[PDB]
Design a protein around this ligand. Structure first.
Ligand code: HEM
Ligand code: HEM
Lengths: 369, 371
């Protein structure tokens, strides 16, 4: 049986073809942070920053302290599956005089009618995703990365997230979200023949083996959601809450059982409703549009009226946003049974390049003089 | 070897002599919440509420769903060491016509000169502590307790915290805080002859508090921007113990966290090796006429402000039989006398009476609240 100490001893690779934090297994603790380059900081300052950040990432992902003046916060813990991932926003390129290298894929997301975005908690020059299965390890990484910014960049926004911890269930299982739904079942899987083309830029050149991430802070309107009946909730998604099986599934069905989108009930109504979330998001309903969803849940407290600031830190990965998040979200905007129960309140789109080779730093091909 | 699945299968007792969440081992996820009774709510409404809350705690601590309309957020997870703990604030008693039953131990904390308390994030009629080693299990419990309040109470304030996870280290060890210090070494330990008298109201102040304890909660921001500019020597002088292993500064290279602190040892210049204002010197029971407490905190980080200052620190939670023989005299001294005071800010506070555990067939606080 897998030992408890494996929570701490497990580690992800920093160096490799792809950056960690994309196909890396879900982590119990997450920090998303965006930085803006400081006044007077340009391409040279950005290059030095990414070099510092990569060195910090390399050390901490191996469970080692920072190079100098380590805080000891993560001392005695193993790497705990820590990953650090770096991305570049549209604005980064104007700030560094690198507009020639700005991918078309970074063109601004649509202004969807259902958007309620806080501009101050959205976008940014630089994005860092930190995740681990230990909270001190995760915070230690966040603080080290943030302190590495120094005079070169400032924290624009920062969000905390969480997921199920390793060992919480008797067997490895798909995660749940705060709506109580099984969440993550139908992601494209490594090993599928079209996975690389769906998710990664093929081998501008600086983005080779990279991916595009869309981040959305989506508040769940739990006060309304939880007033619904179980049947009503399951109709919104088109899958059962108990096990994640399609509503069209029999008693032996599981989350992986194929949808039957034609099956009707006693009343002649579609068993998986025509507006069900897990119907209308499918690649086969969106001209092949696909993405890898790798989110965190969040809860940041209650307001004066007792409304929870809680939901999903939606994070999705694709080779081209126009072949992933964007067409799907265009459809969900007004067509999704789920839309009235959620609010998109922050947004980001970042170019996440390939992994660092040994002796190199993340984004080196882009930033090197 | 302990299996990874033990994180989820481990469970704490709800029913018992003492409430869970006091001597329970440290948990990876914490939610602290205070409620104020609604307009018109009195003893009857409070009794019904604690009755609901107790049923909720009982089910969830055994890894069961809520009695009705469960959200499925905790489905498939084990209990994950979930505990739910209930306390009563000074203000509760005026609201319920139970002033005769208000413990003297709930008398308002002093207004310390170093206090920077947000009144809207302090105190309250009722306090709930929720902890677990899984975050969905922890949130599920928070939401269930909060929804149980209904027409009886509103959320006054709510704070989130975290600690090291089980399995993070190779062997079980004392926790660390966000200043990087070993934190918890010299806590009174169950089994010590004087532990019960230090921490719990005896089985036979008011009778309804039998086997209970008094909790002081402080949201203490750590001034990490200033703290992390110090040399290691300066940081270790503030506490009086090493960061690497938690040993007293008076210890040699063979010393460990269990090595006795030498309060008399001086250097070549005649100054104390463990400084006279060192935190881990001046907080000791032997430096405070026997004042003692069990510290069982969570760390917190709630983001950064516009200037990049982290809203991060310690959700300080301490347990004692009498605050005047615990938190109060110690903080009276730390206020201006502690080398650590310069690097922290007390930004919220609470003092709550936490009664004995619910017996089977009973709810928490029943002796106080029953008609
Ligand atoms: C708080 C907001 C959301 C919640 C609670 C949610 C929940 C779910 C659930 C329960 C499923 C079914 C299980 C699974 O296959 O993972 C699902 C599937 C899916 N969702 Fe969402 N989702 C949210 C937002 C979004 C958004 C904004 C997008 C894209 C614009 C999206 C894209 C997808 C995709 C592509 C699938 C898989 C469909 C398939 O191929 O079967 N989701 N989601
Ligand atoms: C952010 C604020 C604080 C930090 C970082 C902190 C840190 C520490 C550290 C590193 C130790 C030594 C290791 C140990 O035995 O646990 C310690 C011990 C202790 N602290 Fe604090 N502490 C804080 C607040 C407080 C407050 C507000 C009180 C009481 C009013 C307090 C009371 C004590 C006591 C009684 C001990 C053990 C003393 C002994 O050795 O017998 N602490 N603390």
């Amino acid at each position: 049986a897998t030992p408890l100490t494996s929570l701490g001893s497990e580690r992800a690779m920093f160096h490799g073809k792809h950056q960690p934090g994309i196909t890396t297994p879900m982590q119990a603790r997450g920090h998303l942070v965006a930085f803006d380059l400081a006044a007077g900081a340009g391409r040279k300052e950005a290059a030095a920053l990414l070099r510092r950040w990569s060195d910090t990432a390399r050390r901490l992902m191996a469970g080692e302290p920072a190079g100098s003046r380590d805080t000891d916060v993560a001392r005695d813990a193993g790497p705990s599956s820590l990953t650090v991932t770096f991305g570049f926003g549209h604005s980064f390129f104007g700030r560094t005089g690198l507009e020639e290298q700005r991918p078309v894929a970074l063109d601004p997301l649509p202004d969807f009618s259902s958007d309620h975005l806080d501009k101050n908690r959205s976008n940014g020059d630089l994005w860092v995703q930190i995740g681990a299965d230990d909270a001190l390890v995760a915070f230690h990484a966040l603080r080290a990365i943030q302190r590495d910014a120094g005079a070169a960049a400032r924290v624009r926004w920062q969000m905390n997230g969480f997921n199920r911890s390793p060992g919480a269930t008797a067997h490895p299982m798909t995660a749940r979200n705060l709506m109580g739904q099984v969440d993550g079942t139908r992601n494209p899987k490594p090993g599928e023949a079209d996975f690389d083309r769906r998710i990664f830029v093929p081998e501008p050149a600086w983005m080779a083996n990279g991916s595009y991430v869309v981040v959305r802070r989506i508040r769940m309107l739990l006060d309304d959601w939880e007033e619904l009946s179980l049947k009503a909730q399951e109709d919104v998604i088109g899958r059962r809450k108990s096990d994640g099986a399609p509503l069209s599934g029999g008693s032996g069905a599981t989350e992986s059982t194929e949808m039957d989108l034609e099956k009707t009930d006693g009343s002649g109504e579609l068993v998986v409703p025509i507006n069900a979330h897990a119907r209308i998001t499918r690649p086969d309903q969106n001209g092949g549009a696909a993405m890898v969803r790798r989110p965190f849940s969040y809860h940041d407290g209650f307001d004066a009226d007792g409304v929870p600031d809680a939901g999903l830190l939606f994070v999705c990965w694709q080779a081209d946003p126009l072949r992933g998040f964007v067409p799907v979200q265009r459809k969900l905007d007004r067509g999704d049974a789920l839309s009235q129960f959620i609010r998109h309140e922050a947004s980001g789109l970042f170019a996440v390049p390939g992994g660092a080779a040994e002796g190199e730093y993340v984004g080196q091909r882009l930033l090197e003089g």
